[PDB]
């Protein structure tokens, strides 16, 4: 060949600088020097996004009866605590189970602040997003972690010490699943300049035992991305979390009874951190499998949230013993977008989802673990009133965690190329504006930069027509709501299961 | 360990049919029962495209004086023919070189009709685009191949017999590249229900021999995908391809000189076909690398094409002994969209290209072979007149072939779900209309269904702003005009050569 | 002998979950999309009883 | 800081932030760091040693 | 002391020769980006030298203050006076000094 005869000309001809370090703006330049008269018609910008954050919410699953897996697990752990290990008989099954859920929220908070501490020591020349973009996506000021890192470390250690006052079973996979999910960095590819997936809890459950009418886990809001929160705000959040937890007699005898039934080696163990413990991003395909099938349900509903025609639709877990035979009722109203309007794009999520999977042959565990974060709407919630500004949807069942939002961190194409935060569901609405089509195209390109990005459903407001899954398909199926509800029931039963 | 002690429920809960055969419309249905009142706001339509045809054009490599690599190769092959072996003095070097260029067009046409005949025997139940969609994308009537298979077979055999009468050197790797490109299907993911890439000539060079002005090569059009031409149109094309070529007495004199110079074994031989010669799709990442880094230049300019301010910009490989010292002359003008107006989206190609490659370490052969189909504009061609409706762009030296446009085949949105043909460049213009945005969105989704799809530069007419490369970048670099011209000179010289 | 020489399509086309656990309401859904205007004329409810006590 | 000037930790933090004010956030410095990280390996770069309470 | 690259008034200075050599090794053998010259890379290397000098300086300031011995009453107040740092600000917030030194070592690894 000619290439074998003259390899020197081929070598000197094709020496190009590869491996551009992502994290800053790049300008391609002009091939035509007279193209400056067409200013916006030539796109010389080139931005590579680096961080996608999955804003998740811990849930016990769908529950409207006593036949829910949460109530079955409550009855089983109550039998193991009292009827086999001599309990105190000052509480029911549901009080113990809501106490266990409060433990889950505590361990999620500890893994969250441990990830916040461990992220800030990551520095590399090939990625300029490390570690400021991850701290921006977590809603924490990076200067407050640069300046007082030792205070952050000792606060994390003190959280791990104070969380050991109560007890929780180690063999329950719910705790270790939430702690592993909330404390990981997951690259979308096995390359040195990959993109970071993340899991930030926006919801934490706060114990609210007031009155005789039963306990309740009220919502507690976590810092959203772009809010520069310091260590004092996280300490205030932690003290608000254990305000009604420590100093409670019922919680004290519950911790004593769990410490009696399960041994000292049978309880969970929060690991101590120090100055040499840092985490690196790992490649997890099973994380990408459930990230791909993740379906957003929108921002949660609080007591302060105003809804026209929807009163009392807050995301609370109730423990009223006078109604429903004292069941742990938790079924929320989805589709709320954070404010009081119609949110036309959420109608695109009313079709049956497409379960996409890598490879050709799929095991049962792969299909079950790929549908952990999926949620399909089933029936519209009937409003109590003649006028209704939003539209809410009741699901047919969800897993141990739902997805509310997503967060994109990428460099801006305009001066001075700082980080931009883009919050979006799977559904993206593009209304009548000349500045919204190019922004939506840039958001689409930034989404498809990631490998297993969730399947979007873009609604165009000027054509009154939405679009299906905007993702590349390899081996897919159509999932009905009944089969996904069955898989969610299996997942919630297996996660809350404890061995006796 | 709930999955271990209850494996039957885990096995039964995840029995899903995953191998969905592409090639038909799929209605996912409504997950919410009352979502049928939202009309097009719930998109329950899912289509997977199957055919991407890359429409190319053979070129000598932008000759503009005697110092071009094609003229140097003409001098080298003329010294090899007439100085090393006792030849004739009736023909010059440029006549022999353009005879060799016309032999490439004849071999491309033979491989074209051979692929038309060999495609129609492809059938698999998991891909319903076989073989009707490939025959639609190749521009033939699919029913005419099935109804007249015996007349189609001997036509290809007679084309091979009447094109094998002349000689062309097999040591020259121009023919062994073009014939290998023009036949054979190329899957994009090496799976069973993969997507097929193709290569079809948009045009071919028909030999016409004039008097003292020269033996200039002329354009000859080819049927596009929405034509459904029968066998007699291809017979007419083959008849006027060699109408003034087989009727020339001096043609065989220089044809036999190649035979006696290069021997009887170092010649290009055409493979005869029978009823069992069936081609199969193969996986080649070398083809996908140059498919991914490909840039469209537009439709060729003909003598019948009307251009305001561009009277003599027709694509012709001229050779006049009177002017330019008897050199082969070929400098086409790109940027022609087929109509007599300026294509607004062609301004987006004035930025520097992005060479994206898989993996981390790239050899020099991979870099020089990944830039074969790319073509970058350098400077606008000066119009001859006070007004000009289109805008044409002169290249900085193109490679051995140029991509005109692309043809994409997919099933229809509505009844009866027949094949639809989409013709688009690398630049897609979305004008301000009611229904163009969702058509552009489904075009984008169908393009990103393909794995190594070319990078699209979408220009929006409402915002008067275009966007950069719409492709997933993995390991990329910015290519300037000078480096790509340096690569293209090497890639032109490496094909037009003889190692003796 | 089409099933013998094409067994993969036959295997993939019939992957259905068959062991439905009784004890809960099952909504079969609407096969016709515009059948929700017929209200109770389309029964999409399927219940399986579990206990018969002979007193 | 010269000897005899009682400088606190805030002054040293101000000096450090003045040192890397134009260093971090520079595109030319970023591609320079990427090119040195490409030419010299990860084991071929300098290694600032971590300190703790037992290192004196 | 003061860190210096040496005397330089020509292109034959050892600093310029080392700049050209490291530029050849970065670009002409390891595929550089060609957005900078030899001298930009060498001044960047000198900025790295000043960064590592600062890190060793604050590390010495931190490590000196834990030295106490009865036979030498200069330890460690005289060394902290000679370094221009208040010894009370190292007695009172030593952990902040240690974590600042560690954060300097972490941030200096970005380049």
From Swiss-Prot, chains A, B:
<protein>
    <recommendedName>
        <fullName>Capsid protein precursor</fullName>
    </recommendedName>
</protein>
<dbReference type="GO" id="GO:0039617">
    <property type="term" value="C:T=3 icosahedral viral capsid"/>
</dbReference>
<keyword id="KW-1142">T=3 icosahedral capsid protein</keyword>
<keyword id="KW-0167">Capsid protein</keyword>
<keyword id="KW-0007">Acetylation</keyword>
<dbReference type="InterPro" id="IPR048835">
    <property type="entry name" value="CP_picobirnavirus"/>
</dbReference>
<comment type="subunit">
    <text>Homodimer.</text>
</comment>
<comment type="function">
    <text>The capsid protein self-assembles to form an icosahedral capsid with a T=2 symmetry made of 120 subunits.</text>
</comment>
<dbReference type="InterPro" id="IPR049178">
    <property type="entry name" value="CP_picobirnavirus_sf"/>
</dbReference>
<feature type="site" description="Cleavage">
    <location>
        <begin position="18"/>
        <end position="19"/>
    </location>
</feature>
<keyword id="KW-0946">Virion</keyword>
<dbReference type="Pfam" id="PF20816">
    <property type="entry name" value="PBV_CP"/>
</dbReference>
Curated annotation (Swiss-Prot), chain C:
<protein>
    <recommendedName>
        <fullName>Capsid protein precursor</fullName>
    </recommendedName>
</protein>
<comment type="subunit">
    <text>Homodimer.</text>
</comment>
<comment type="function">
    <text>The capsid protein self-assembles to form an icosahedral capsid with a T=2 symmetry made of 120 subunits.</text>
</comment>
<feature type="site" description="Cleavage">
    <location>
        <begin position="18"/>
        <end position="19"/>
    </location>
</feature>
UniProtKB/Swiss-Prot annotation, chain D:
<comment type="subunit">
    <text>Homodimer.</text>
</comment>
<protein>
    <recommendedName>
        <fullName>Capsid protein precursor</fullName>
    </recommendedName>
</protein>
<comment type="function">
    <text>The capsid protein self-assembles to form an icosahedral capsid with a T=2 symmetry made of 120 subunits.</text>
</comment>
